[PDB]
Structures are given as structure tokens and as C-alpha cells.
Subunit: 271 residues, 3 copies
């Protein structure tokens, strides 16, 4: 026999996780650490994911690898709604990349490990399960549509990785009587989507509109301008049957402002 | 390869777990025990509830009837009649829980919807009917919060290990399933738990430390050594007290220390 | 089918773990024996040597050890160590003792499932499950809370001095200590705990080599300051061992005995006399 262990997943995923250091200038001279967090190297190009709140208002950003290599990092963009931020590091002499299986479907009960730097103790692995799946939909909803896990999450785990027993990335750790074993991560599929969009446009451009029964209507919104009223029953959006409020709103977000569709001219979501 | 997962147990047991709602006085969780619509939960969840509501992970909601409750075990049985089929919690009565067994707690902590947390059995506790304290419950480092109460604790096979009851970290308790079964049946039948009460406490034989005034024992002294209760050898204080509880009030039994005692109903 | 379980490890290791009770005679006015604090301990071998945390037994007038088999023993303090917070006890045993499983050849790995065995809040023996979050170091030289073993297995007051074992029951470490930090707890690596025990058994205390790689500073009156070494010196050899690591070198110095004299190359070959580490 041999000891039960998840070290496999640790060997594979860990190196691609990094310590992130927000550095600001203190007016009341040099750079002082404002905060810290974790991040995941996504691909060989040097793209990294992390939590927006970690890098917010940073004058300088630094990224350290478990192999000891340190890099100055460039903010590629961020997103409030998902609390995600993409960084990039140059000077590539090769990089560890987080294992990814796009074909992998997360299931409730799946063993997962959270990799991060809680309280700047150095890299820390903690074990738990997927308590709840959440959604990969682009449209914001709330803390309920994230992935939920009883794997232990502290300050410093933010932007860290959540991987299954195979090291495959399940999500990005966002945030955690005293609630015990309740922590959240952004589903990896969604994180991918956000990353690409930030890489591409320097920001996340969301389609905004303002059966499914209309409870209210946004003044001056795209809907109010097209002639839609309260109590209307929406059966089709851009030729797609509207059978779900969640699925419909996720679809609207993928649509680009300026576009015109049969149900209106899409606008960009308000900050 | 495939990811290490307990999702199997989740598929099996989860559906039989429900959100319970006591304006709302409080909320909690419950376990559907069988196809008749009987549900288990914690008494403290439903106490002084004007109405009780039960929601299923399949979206079906039911008005629920309090079948009875128990303070000592903090258990309560509900019932809903359901035309359609109902999910029931997997049960293996032959299964012996062991310390170290992987377990999952299924419940609705902080009303976040159904939540699964993973841990192990830290300690077994006892299935004895006689109350003792928080030590004779099942103990687990699986995460338990407000809203997990009345929820289910199951092993990797989905088999019900116990009902979740209640800065200390990774210390949580559940009523052993074997005991929960017994309590359920008794509440279903009598609308309450009728316990055989004698009115002694003490610590082969059992030495009487004290005697309850007006109790069944006082009516039939300290320092007595009890060697036989109703023809059963008294070799254990725990096993004896559990035995007394199963005996019904009004009954009369031989006690050898040969006296004749009349069992009463336990004081609230 | 059968339920996923670690009970195997529990069966093997648990019996060798014990409840420890610090007792003093000045605790009450009537000068009776009363518990000042309590903890857990691990029976190491058949001789009755037990490991526990120093902070558990500190200033104990009496020490008591209880076994999961009901046997109780008066215990003798063999010695302690502040730096690792370890203490060795001994019990006079007759009729054999449970001993904690040990595999010296076993290499702990991050992610390995572990169980913490102890007596949290004196609830009786309690098992909690987690993994090794970080390895730490087995080096003798003190560093800090970072070079211990780290684990998300649940640790409370009363787990101190308890055992942390893998799925095979093999002792991985001795549990030392644990916004509210969740799933952050520490144990002394077993390899190191062994080293400390033997040294305490033998010398009644841990005798450490102290000296006082680019030199950032120098200790006044220290062995180094007395041999002629200065700041900014580059140390390339310590007692004929290449100094390629600050960690590996300091651990090496600790193994050296006070009074000893060794060559240090910085070329200048000096002669230093090792001293005993300051409390």
C-alpha cells in the first residue's frame, strides 16, 4: 500500500500558481505592499488570472513563481462584476501553465484542492469538495452562481486555483456565528471567457437590454426605447426561444452594443 | 483517469434532503425517511412554529404536519402527504459506522440552497435511548453551520449515518441514524416519545449514588447494588438506562438488589 | 461495496495516543492537585517515552497520562525544548504499551491525506481529516512557524502534542498549534521530532551549536565576532562542507557541539569555537 494522497494534482497545478503583490506609493515614499493575493498562469504567453480586488489601485504589480522567478506584471484589464483581472508577464524563458480540461464537467461532490498563499505563509494547499456548481453564464447574478466549496479559503487565497484530483482547473478562488467551509470560486469555463475578452478588448463589453414576464423596465434603456412595457411576455430573443431568465440574460451579454435584434438596439451595461 | 469524487453519494442521498421553514420564525433542513412522507428534523427548528413548510430539490413544496418532537434528542418528525413519488434517504440498518469513515453533510446552511460539505466521523457516540449529553452523539469535522440542522450525514455510499444537530473548528454533531430511526417510529406512533423512567442515577453491578424523591425507585435506597433489572443482568449503567426507557409507564417489573417497581413517564 | 474510510489508520495509530494532564499544587488554596492545562501525547516506544508540547506541561507539579485502554500513569518530565515546543515524558510501564507507527523511510508529500488525533476540549479522543498543506523542514536550527508541517486538518486546544498520521497510520508529525484563520494548523515533522526526542533522552536537553552566503550582520561577542569575521564576508565553506544554502548551513551548525573548533573559509581560513544557542 501507499498513503492516500492528492500530491499528483499538487505536482501538476501548483507551479502555475503564483503570489501576487499589489504595491502602492505611500504619500504619508517608496512602494509598500497594499495587499497580496494569488494568480494562475493560463498559457505559455504569460497571461495570468487573479481577482480584481487584489490588484485594485496598484502602482506596481509583482508576480512570483514557485520556482523562485519573479516578474514585473502588466494589467491587461479587469472586471468588477466577476472580480477578475488578467495580468501578463514578459521575459518568457518558459512558464508553468495550469492544467485545463475544457471538456471536463464539474460535479457536486468532486474532490477539489485550493492552491494559494493565505496570510503570505508561502504556497498552501487545502482540501475539500464541490459543495455547489454555480453557473458559467456571462451575466452577473450574485454570489450564488459561483462555484461553492468547503475547501478552506482565507485572505491570500484570492485569485488562487481550485483544481480536482487530476490537477484540472475547476475555478478561481474569489472569496470566503462564523461561517465554516463556505468559500467561492469563479467557474473555470467562465474565467476563460472573461480572460479572453479582457485580453481582446482591454475590458469586458457586455450586451445590455434593461416565457419570461417583465416585472419592470429600465427608463431610457434599450427596452424602454423599443416600445416594450411591463407585464409583456417575452417568447423569443434574437430567434432564440426564451425559456429561462438566466439563459436569456447570459445570451444578451454576449451580444455587442450597437447591434439590432428581433424580439431593439443593444447598449453597453452600466458600470 | 477520472477526478476523485463523492458525487455518487450526492446523487443518491441529496434529493431526499429538504429545506425546512418555520413571517418566518426560522429555517432548517430535513430528511425524507420513507415513501409515506415522514421527515426528520431538529425540534429546535420547528419549535413554536405556526406553520411548517417543506421544499424539495425538485421544486415541489408541501405544507407539513408536526407528528411530534423530542427535547432530549432535539428531534422532530414531520409528515407531508404526496400524490407523486418521493425521494427517500438511503438507509442500511446493517451498516456499522466506524471512526474515520468519510461522511458528507447535506443541508441548507444560511439558506444558500443545498450545500454539501466533506469530513469524517471523528467519534461514534451511542444509539441508546436514554439521554446522556453531547458526547454520545456522532461527531464529525465535516462543516456544519446554521441551516445544516436536521440535515443528513451520509457515507460515501449515500447511506444515512446520522441527522445533523449542532472558535471551535471541525467539531460538529449528529444524532446516530440508528437512534433517529427509533425516535422517529416512536413519534409516529405515540405523537411523542414515551420514556420508561425509574428515577435513579449511579455508576459487576451498578451502585446507587442517589435516589429520586417520589420516583418509582423511592416508592418501591442509596448504596444499593443492582444486579438484575426485569430479569436482565445489569452489567452496564448505560445499557441498563437504555433498557428502562424502552419499558412503558404503568408496567411492573422485578428488580434484584427482589422488589417490585412501577415504571413512570420521564419528567420533561 | 464498502464506505470510503480511514478507520484503518485509526485502528493502527489511535491507541498509541494519550490524554495528558498538567497538574499543580499551587493551583488552589488547599494545595490539592488540579488541572492547570491539558493536552495530548504520543507513545514513541515500548520504554514509555512520550512526546507532547512543552507548553502543555510547563510548570507542572504533577503530570498524568491516560491511555485509551483506561490505564493511567504518573509521568516524569525527561526534558523540553522551547524552540520546537516539544517535551519528552516517560511512564513506568508494565504489561506492554501501544506505540505510534513510524516509517522513517516515508517521505511526506504535500497533498497526502492526514488525520489529526488528539483530545480537543477534553471531549475524549477525536479524529479530524485533512491534508499536508506544506512540508516544513526537519532541520534542527530554529526558524519560525513556516518550517513546521502545515495542515488543514482541524486542530483545537487539546490537540496539542497529539499525532498527525497518514492514511497508513504512519506518524507524520506532532501537532503543535493552530478574521479567524480556518484550516491552518501546524505539526513538527516526525523526522525532526525523533531527532529532538533522542537528544532530550540522552542529554536531558537539546544542546545546539551556535555561531552568531553573504554576511548581513554579526553577533557581538558571538563565536563569529570572536574569530575575526566581519559583515559582507562571503562564506564558501563551513567545517569543510560547501556552504551553498543558508538553511542547510544553519541546520549543520546546530548539530555541532559547543566547545568544538572548526575551519571556516571566507581567501581567509579562520578558526571558530562553537557556543550554545541563547535561550
Amino acid at each position: 500500500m501507499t498513503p492516500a494522497s492528492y500530491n499528483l494534482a499538487v505536482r501538476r497545478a501548483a507551479p502555475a500558481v503564483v503570489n501576487v503583490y499589489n504595491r502602492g506609493l505611500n504619500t504619508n515614499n517608496q512602494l509598500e505592499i497594499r495587499t497580496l493575493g494569488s494568480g494562475v498562469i493560463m498559457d505559455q504567453r504569460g497571461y495570468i488570472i487573479t481577482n480584481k480586488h487584489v490588484i485594485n489601485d496598484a502602482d506596481q504589480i509583482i508576480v512570483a513563481l514557485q520556482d523562485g522567478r519573479v516578474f514585473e506584471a502588466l494589467l491587461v484589464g479587469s472586471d468588477s462584476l466577476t472580480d477578475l483581472a488578467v495580468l501578463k508577464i514578459n521575459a518568457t524563458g518558459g512558464l508553468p501553465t495550469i492544467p485545463i480540461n475544457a471538456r471536463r464537467v464539474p460535479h457536486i461532490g468532486d474532490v477539489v484542492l485550493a492552491i494559494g498563499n493565505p496570510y503570505n505563509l508561502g504556497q498552501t494547499i487545502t482540501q475539500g469538495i464541490i459543495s455547489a456548481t454555480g453557473r458559467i453564464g456571462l451575466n452577473p447574478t450574485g454570489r450564488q452562481n459561483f462555484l461553492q466549496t468547503d475547501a478552506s479559503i482565507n485572505h491570500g487565497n484570492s485569485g488562487g486555483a481550485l483544481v480536482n484530483s487530476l490537477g484540472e482547473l475547476m475555478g478561481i478562488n474569489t472569496l470566503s456565528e462564523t461561517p465554516e467551509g463556505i468559500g467561492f470560486a469563479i467557474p473555470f469555463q467562465l474565467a476563460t471567457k472573461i480572460m479572453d475578452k479582457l485580453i481582446r478588448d482591454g475590458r469586458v463589453i457586455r450586451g445590455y437590454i434593461g416565457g419570461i414576464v417583465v416585472n419592470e423596465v429600465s427608463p431610457d434603456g434599450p427596452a424602454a426605447n423599443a416600445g416594450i412595457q411591463v407585464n409583456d411576455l417575452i417568447i423569443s430573443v434574437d430567434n432564440k426561444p426564451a425559456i429561462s431568465a438566466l439563459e436569456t440574460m447570459d445570451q444578451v451579454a454576449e451580444i455587442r452594443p450597437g447591434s439590432v435584434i428581433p424580439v431593439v438596439t443593444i447598449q453597453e451595461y452600466p458600470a
